[PDB]
Symmetry: D2
Subunit: 125 residues, 4 copies
């Protein structure tokens, strides 16, 4: 009766110390598991922030690309437009000279003035 109670008290105190040994070692493993999770969680949050900066950086240069691209197309067509222009100018020059040369054949007007000088000459004689 009494012996049986005293041995129940001591079992409950040993049981308590046996738990605490188990708990202490599981608490220590938990602080490692947690400390490991925070460092691991902070590295992915940093990487996420890094991808954010990465994408914001790439987006500016996408707009910068665009402005140069419209300017780059305009300069291209002007380079070919100028060139057509000088071809046009040369072709109108050459044609306006051919046109002149045609009236040269008409003039070889001289013979008219000589026939007139000859008429005056004979009239004298």
């Amino acid at each position: 009766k009494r012996i049986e109670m005293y041995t129940k008290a001591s079992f409950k105190a040993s049981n308590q110390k046996i738990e605490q040994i188990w708990k202490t070692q599981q608490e220590e493993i938990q602080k490692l598991n947690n400390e490991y999770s925070q460092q691991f969680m902070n590295v992915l949050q940093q990487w996420e922030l890094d991808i954010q900066k990465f994408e914001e950086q790439g987006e500016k240069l996408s707009n910068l690309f665009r402005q140069q691209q419209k300017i780059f197309q305009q300069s291209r067509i002007v380079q070919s437009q100028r060139m057509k222009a000088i071809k046009q100018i040369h072709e109108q020059f050459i044609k306006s000279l051919e046109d002149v040369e045609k009236n040269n054949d008409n003039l070889f007007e001289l013979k008219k003035e000589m026939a007139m000088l000859q008429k005056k000459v004979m009239m004298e004689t």
Copy 2:
């Protein structure tokens, strides 16, 4: 009279000849210029097309690198989301097993030990 008309006609010739001789010189100057000019302009049309084609390629190369740029951003963000998924599953699993535990089965076998020491005593 005949002697006059003859004289006028030989003179008329020599004057028309001086003129045309002088015209032909310039018109041969004109002709060789046009030809040389139009020949160089024509290969130049080609060269300037080539120019515009290299500038066109350099422009496609940027479009290719921005594609890769965005492809790299998508695959990082997916790898990163999957790393985080495995980790959170692992943490939840440990949290699950901890919550389950152990201290009762200790108390059970201590009861059994007590039972046999009461029995023996």
Copy 3:
């Protein structure tokens, strides 16, 4: 006297015609050279502005290259850091498991020491 007068009259009218026709030509020549030079100088500039944009592209291409290189570098740092964290975790468990398995200070020996005490405590008052 009459014949010489009308000969010099004709000569002058002849020299003028030659001269007019020459002035027309030389007017076309100089008008053409003038335009030609104005449009070539202008072409020299537009060509030189094309180089400018083609050069700004190169600098934007190179700019993105560096950024592309920089992400790569950072990613490899981010990976090197989370590998170092993980392996520091893993070895930290190994060393915790090492102390718990200790023949004289680990948890099984501390259990046995409690069981050692309880059993003599119970035997003492019972017998």
Copy 4:
């Protein structure tokens, strides 16, 4: 005396067995996680290489295209010189031809006046 020592030793061994089996379960989870984790890192490390290989290949195709762009800009300048030269020589030739035509003694007006002056002399001579 003997009955209690062997009863206590059997229970030591049972408890330590309770301990071990839960420890083995946790170490099972830690190992399965470590494998899966070191698996996605090696894929990430492959990912890193594949974009560098894409980066590097584009960089070298870009320098090649810029070199060809620069050899096309040099050609624009050579074409410019040639056409400038050809026009310069045309004008300069035009000028030389008009001086020679405007020479006082041998120009084309003084050939027009010489021809004219013979003709006038042919006419007068005979009429006398």
